[PDB]
Amino acid sequence: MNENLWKICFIVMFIIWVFVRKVYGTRAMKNKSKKKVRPNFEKSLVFLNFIGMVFLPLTAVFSSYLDSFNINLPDSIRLFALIVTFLNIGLFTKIHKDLGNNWSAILEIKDGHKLVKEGIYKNIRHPMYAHLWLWVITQGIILSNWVVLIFGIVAWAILYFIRVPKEEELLIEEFGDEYIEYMGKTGRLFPK
Ligand SMILES: Nc1ncnc2c1ncn2[C@@H]1O[C@H](CSCC[C@H](N)C(=O)O)[C@@H](O)[C@H]1O
């Protein structure tokens, strides 16, 4: 109930959410790049979310600035998020482990890149995104603030929406038919 509390909660899930990536990422950044794509652009699109995921909500916690925009939400609906975010971080570490040396945020195609249909990736390509999709939906409700809610959602949806079709096109360049088959056998976010 205490508001100062939820902040302490989130800044943890976050702190750990970040830890999960900081671990798996530096591991796959030690693998050299082959072809990148419009990276000077994606970088910004990312950094755009970087506001949405981190810079922005960090300041719904460590600062009172955004206070007037928060949603005055009942504790019931907030916990519902806190649960799901938990499940998320699992899924994250699931996904993120399933991916490993292939991951980047910029559309890299890595030197030894191997296409993975096998993991949480069977029946879902871009699970990670679907994760992120949730991530932004949840953290707004958890933090119960409209800006942190509304903004974050947008900045992703965009990056998402203009991101994915190049990504798919890109993977098709490299893997050719193996990817077209894949998409037939998979959905983008939910399965089937
Ligand atoms: N199905 C796949 N198998 C292996 N690498 C993939 C992949 N889909 C995307 N990638 C790589 O992953 C990087 C983006 S990370 C995003 C991965 C996936 N879209 C997800 O959200 O779960 C891109 O550089 C792309 O080269």
From Swiss-Prot:
InterPro entries: ICMT_MeTrfase (IPR007269), Isoprenylcys_mtase (IPR054851). Carboxyl methyltransferase with activity toward prenyl lipids. In vitro, displays activity toward N-acetyl-S-farnesyl-L-cysteine (AFC) and S-farnesylthioacetic acid (FTA), an analog of AFC. It is a multi-pass membrane protein. S-adenosyl-L-methionine binds at E108, H113, K114, L115, V116, Y121, H126, P127, M128, Y129, E167. Residues 29-37, 99-125, 167-192 are cytoplasmic. This is Protein-S-isoprenylcysteine O-methyltransferase. Substrate binds at R163. The chain crosses the membrane at residues 2-28, 38-62, 74-98, 126-144, 146-166. Belongs to the class VI-like SAM-binding methyltransferase superfamily. Isoprenylcysteine carboxyl methyltransferase family. It catalyses: [protein]-C-terminal S-[(2E,6E)-farnesyl]-L-cysteine + S-adenosyl-L-methionine = [protein]-C-terminal S-[(2E,6E)-farnesyl]-L-cysteine methyl ester + S-adenosyl-L-homocysteine. Keywords: Cell membrane, Membrane, Methyltransferase, S-adenosyl-L-methionine, Transferase, Transmembrane, Transmembrane helix. The keyword Nucleotide-binding does not apply. GO terms for biological process: methylation. NCBIfam families: isopcys_mtase. The keyword Transmembrane applies. Its EC number is 2.1.1.100. GO terms for cellular component: plasma membrane. Residues 1, 63-73, 145 are extracellular. It is found in: Cell membrane. One of its GO terms (molecular function) is protein C-terminal S-isoprenylcysteine carboxyl O-methyltransferase activity.
